[PDB]
């Protein structure tokens, strides 16, 4: 059978890649940072507690001004907060309450959200009338929306439970490109700082690097044992971190094409739900199923801090563009700002 | 100046806050339900008797609002999107009892739902559907349940069982055996957090909307008794 001819040949292509990466792995990140001094103990306190959501929060996203942020809760609400004064700026009621992701446009004029409705809805924040209404409804995913991120006012990338990712032209509402490498549900995506690439993690325990303008999968990363739930780019765009249900976080490098560091502990037996780096990339913050957030020294793989305020599962966390504050959403319906 | 903005922002926040209080009363009054089941289980028939990624059904029993959600355009892998329904009042699980092997597959799905970390406090209203089809398969006698379930040979109808009038004891023994296969999973990890409410149903039973209401009332009662450490 020719199906075995192609299944035994791909095995050799997996052995060739395994040895091509093995040769590049001359040293490990741990020994190169065996001499750098640790960050110490990181103590962050809750500065703001954003209340107003009725049900569990699933996603949040900072604005580019590092002050405004949007949060999505499964009671069917998008709330735009002023993190300084804790004042709500907008409260957008959603058509479908089973929202799983939200996004802030870099211009600050649009927000996006989506979930089990299989639709990415775009809202106009700055209308001439002064209201917030739906600008576009992007349909074309056959599975639930897991993540969405704006490239600009007219382009947004979405990841879906139907195992694909897609790039949308917002004004026309049509998929410009489609990314069909994964075999499991895609759970999260992260745009490179130059917005020319993006990485996505799926439920096949793998992550993939995509060319936005070309539409191809450049690199595929493995190493995790279970579903990848979270993914985030390193500040320089040359690396990214993934959090999985196998209770570990891992760091990958694009140019080395392999995992550099694993952030784990023997007492941690719960999955990671969200990851984000600090402004310099020295800190890797991760939310966990056990209601806590762990601050990881991304260079030494040592745990440096813990944010312990949340009553329930931590769903999301974001770092401001100026690195001043960290937000955390949780299933307890509260958002906490930590400095 | 800066002071004028803080005034105008404080006005917008209070207007949003009054709307949120109104939303809180509407949200806390509706009871959300997840409807699960195979393609041949008959749940789509129970839906109409009472492509988007999810479908909604809003019905009312005794002036109580119920919001039933049916999964539409999703893949058969549920381990991710099923976590969204951890806060529903109950999960309505529909099983085709006459499908003895869809029945073992339904037993396996019930086991993973029952033992899921995020669904541990969610009760399950279990509909053992297609009871009329099960009667025709046992009365005919062409296919023995003992083939796919060899423990049916040594199984006797329990004494607490209440067979319907005009029912062949072979049918009563068959349908109560299937119920016990599910109850063996339910009573192994109950622990008082959640409970399974099994019902022998038919896809056209007009009393199905009442079984959900009566089970949801029992679920909320056990939730209140739990907040006072009474039960």
């Amino acid at each position, epitope marked *: 059978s020719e199906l075995d001819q192609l*299944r035994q040949e791909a095995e050799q292509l*997996k052995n060739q890649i395994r040895d091509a990466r093995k040769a590049c792995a001359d040293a490990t990140l741990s020994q190169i940072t065996n001499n750098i001094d640790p960050v110490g103990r990181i103590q962050m306190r809750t500065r703001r507690t954003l209340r107003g959501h009725l049900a569990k929060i699933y996603a949040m996203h900072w604005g580019t001004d590092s002050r405004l942020l949007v949060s999505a809760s499964q009671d069917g609400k998008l709330i735009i907060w002023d993190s300084y004064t804790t004042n709500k700026v907008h409260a957008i009621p959603l058509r479908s309450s089973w929202v799983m992701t939200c996004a802030y446009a870099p211009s600050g004029n649009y927000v996006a959200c989506g979930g089990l409705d299989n639709i990415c809805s775009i809202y106009n924040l700055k209308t001439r009338e002064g209201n917030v209404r739906v600008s576009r409804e992007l349909a074309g995913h056959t599975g639930y929306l897991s993540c969405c991120r704006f490239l600009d006012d007219n382009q947004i990338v979405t990841s879906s439970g139907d*195992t694909t990712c897609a790039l949308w032209d917002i004004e026309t509402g049509q998929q410009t490109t489609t990314f069909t490498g994964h*075999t*499991g549900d895609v759970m999260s995506l992260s745009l490179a700082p130059d917005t020319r690439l993006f990485v996505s993690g799926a*439920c*096949d*325990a793998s992550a993939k690097l995509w060319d936005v303008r070309e539409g191809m999968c450049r690199q595929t990363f*493995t*190493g995790h*044992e*279970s*579903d990848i739930n979270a993914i985030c780019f390193f500040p320089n765009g040359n690396a990214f971190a993934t959090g999985s*249900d*196998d*209770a570990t976080c891992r760091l990958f490098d694009l140019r080395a094409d392999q995992e550099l560091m694993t952030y784990s502990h023997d007492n941690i*037996i719960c*999955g990671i739900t969200s990851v984000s780096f600090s402004k310099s990339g020295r800190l890797l913050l991760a939310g966990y199923d056990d209601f806590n957030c762990n601050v990881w020294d991304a260079l030494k793989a040592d745990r440096a801090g813990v944010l312990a305020g949340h009553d329930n599962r931590v769903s999301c966390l974001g770092v401001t563009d100026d690195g001043m504050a960290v937000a955390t959403g949780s299933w307890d319906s509260f958002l906490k700002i930590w400095n | 100046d800066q002071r004028n903005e803080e005034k105008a922002q404080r006005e917008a926040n209070k207007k949003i806050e009054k709307q949120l209080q109104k939303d809180k009363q509407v949200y806390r009054a509706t009871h959300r339900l997840l409807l699960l089941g195979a393609g041949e289980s008959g749940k789509n028939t129970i839906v109409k008797q009472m492509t988007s990624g999810i479908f909604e059904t809003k019905f009312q029993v005794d002036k109580v609002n119920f919001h039933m959600f049916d999964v539409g355009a999703q*893949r*058969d*892998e*549920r*381990r991710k999107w*099923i976590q969204c329904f951890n806060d529903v009042t109950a999960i309505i699980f529909v099983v085709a009892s006459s499908s003895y*092997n869809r029945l*073992q*597959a339904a037993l*396996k799905l019930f*086991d*993973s*739902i*029952w*033992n*899921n*970390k995020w669904l541990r406090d969610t009760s399950v209203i279990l509909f053992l559907n297609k009871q009329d089809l099960l009667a025709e398969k046992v009365l005919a006698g062409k296919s023995k349940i003992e*083939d*796919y*379930f*060899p*423990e049916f040979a040594r199984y006797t109808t329990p004494e607490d069982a209440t067979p319907e009038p005009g029912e062949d004891p072979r049918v009563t023994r068959a349908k109560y055996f299937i119920r016990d296969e599910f109850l063996r999973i339910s009573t192994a*990890s109950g622990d008082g957090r959640h409970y399974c409410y099994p019902h022998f149903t038919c896809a056209v039973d007009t009393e199905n909307i009442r079984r959900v209401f009566n089970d949801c009332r029992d679920i909320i009662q056990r939730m209140h008794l739990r907040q006072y450490e009474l039960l």
Partner: nanobody, 128 residues
Framework: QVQLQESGGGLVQPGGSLRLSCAASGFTFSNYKMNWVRQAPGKGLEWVSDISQSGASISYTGSVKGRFTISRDNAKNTLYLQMNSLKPEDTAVYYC?????????????????????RGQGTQVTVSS
């Protein structure tokens, strides 16, 4: 890289014996529940048997009780399905399926059409 490689199988007579083996790689074997699933010709995937992390709790589909015995050697990272007194209806491709998450009591999606943590399979043929 999670990989499951099923061995054994082939042609056998009714009442014969076949011992299926599943070599695991790329994950801590002991932290995971393991399953056996099969796909008969022209039919869907069916769960056959599973075994807990340590090997104490064991379950079977009724049609193979008294005939098939599942076991695991965590030190050897291997799953086994000893199949005694085979019947012609036991002809199928047998897949060694891993459970998606570690340290869990639930085990979702192991019989899905596109499940990721499943091997390619091995063929078992029981005929005259």
């Amino acid at each position: 890289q999670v990989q499951l490689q099923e061995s054994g199988g082939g042609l056998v007579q009714p009442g014969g014996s076949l011992r299926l083996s599943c070599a695991a790689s790329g994950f801590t074997f002991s932290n995971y529940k393991m399953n056996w699933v099969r796909q008969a010709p022209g039919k869907g995937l069916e769960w056959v048997s599973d075994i807990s992390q340590s090997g104490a709790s064991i379950s079977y589909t009724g049609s193979v009780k008294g005939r098939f015995t599942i076991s695991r050697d965590n030190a050897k990272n291997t799953l086994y399905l000893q199949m005694n007194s085979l019947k012609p209806e036991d002809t199928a491709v047998y897949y060694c399926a891993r459970c998606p998450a570690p340290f869990t009591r639930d085990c979702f999606d192991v019989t899905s059409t596109t499940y990721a943590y499943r091997g390619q399979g091995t063929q078992v043929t029981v005929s005259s």
